Amino acid sequence: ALTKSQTDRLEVLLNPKDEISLNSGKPFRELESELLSRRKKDLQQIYAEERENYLGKLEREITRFFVDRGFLEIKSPILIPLEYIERMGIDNDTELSKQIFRVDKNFCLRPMLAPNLYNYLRKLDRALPDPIKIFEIGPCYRKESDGKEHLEEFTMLGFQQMGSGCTRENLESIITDFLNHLGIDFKIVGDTLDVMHGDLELSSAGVGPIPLDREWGIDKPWIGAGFGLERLLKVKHDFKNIKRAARSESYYNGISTNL
């Protein structure tokens, strides 16, 4: 019989597509030698044929999608003024207030894209025609309890349209086309709405105006949504734990690097 520790080790080495039964009575040392061999070949094939990282590749695919549909690609600071958090209505009452990674006296690691997108919408509205369509992909940081669905360092897609066409129907049509294009199953439940894969939250979307808009100098209708890229990789690759999709030293494209 295998120990819990030995099975822990075997499951790090196991890929969702693997047809191997741990429970069959073969010895740990041999099961481990089989899986070690498969995982080295998986890396060898990636290195020989494609060489692209899942997270980077997904970011590039999402980028082409939104560029093609008319959204301006934004890259804004990751390290943001701590006052952007209070101005988002997060002031020691919300769960998120205690999730902030603080950096100096006045800065933090952004936990969300909304502040920077707000600022870009206000600024670009003096220069661009209606409607204004922007999106950003990049790192976000939140302290979390260990979870199968949570990382402290993750990657968020955020997009926002401001002006005409900001209806809930249009927002659902963007979400629907976007996830059908990546091959990710979902249902939309709900102005605020959530995009869910079973009990896993893929995204939270919203329809404005809302009263928070005036703190940021926004007085137009808008629609938007945020998606976590690692949750999407988790679903499309059927990973059991989101840390196989994360920026990490322990996993490459969901294959363990401790061989």
Ligand X SMILES: N[C@@H](Cc1cccc2ccccc12)C(=O)O
Chain residues in the site for ligand ANP (CB under 6 A): 142, 144, 149-151, 154, 156, 201-204, 226-228, 230-231
Binding of Mg ion by 204 (CB under 5 A) = yes
Task: Select from ligand ANP, a second copy, ligand X, none the partner in contact with residue 187, using the beta carbon and a kind-dependent cut-off of 5 to 8 Å.
Answer: none
Nearer to a second copy (CB atom), residue 197 or residue 243: 243
Q: Residues binding Mg ion: what is the number (CB under 5 A)?
A: 1
Stretch that binds Mg ion, among 22-30, 69-77, 158-166, 199-207 (CB under 5 A): 199-207
Burial of 148 (0-12, 13-18, 19+ CB in 10 A): exposed
H-type alpha helices, 126-167: none
Q: Is 199 exposed, middle or buried (0-12, 13-18, 19+ CB in 10 A)?
A: exposed
Q: Among residue numbers 150 through 169, which ones bind a second copy (CB under 8 A)?
A: 152-153
* Secondary structure of residue 195 in the 3-state scheme: strand
Closest CB to ligand X among residues 204, 241:
204
Give the separation between CA 26 and CA 79, rounded to whole angstroms.
51
Residues numbered 68 to 87 that lie near a second copy (CB under 8 A) are 70-79
User: What six digits make up the tokens of 195?
Assistant: 């995009």
Q: Which amino acid is at 95?
A: E
Q: Which of 73, 131, 81, 74 has the alpha carbon at shortest distance from 106?
A: 81
Q: Which residues bind ligand X (CB under 6 A)?
A: 112-114, 117, 156, 158, 160, 204-206, 224-226
30-39, long-range: CB < 8 A, 24+ apart:
31/2, 35/10, 36/259, 38/13, 39/13, 39/15, 39/255, 39/256, 39/259
Using alpha carbons only, give the angle 200, 191, 78 rounded to the nearest 5 degrees.
60
What is the nearest approach in angstroms of a second copy to the Cβ of residue 153? 5
Tokens, residue 246: 């994360």
Tokens found for residue 22: 């741990």
Task: Identify residues 93-152 at the interface with a second copy (CB under 8 A).
Answer: 101, 103-104, 109, 116, 119-120, 123-124, 126-129, 139, 141, 152
Q: Which of 111/254 has CB closer to Mg ion? A: 111
| Residues 33-72 interacting with a second copy (rule: CB under 8 A) | 39-40, 43-44, 46-47, 50-53, 55-56, 60, 63, 67, 70-72
Contact residues toward a second copy (CB under 8 A) are 39-40, 43-44, 46-47, 50-53, 55-56, 60, 63, 67, 70-79, 101, 103-104, 109, 116, 119-120, 123-124, 126-129, 139, 141, 152-153, 246-249, 252, 257-259
Contact residues toward Mg ion (CB under 5 A) are 204
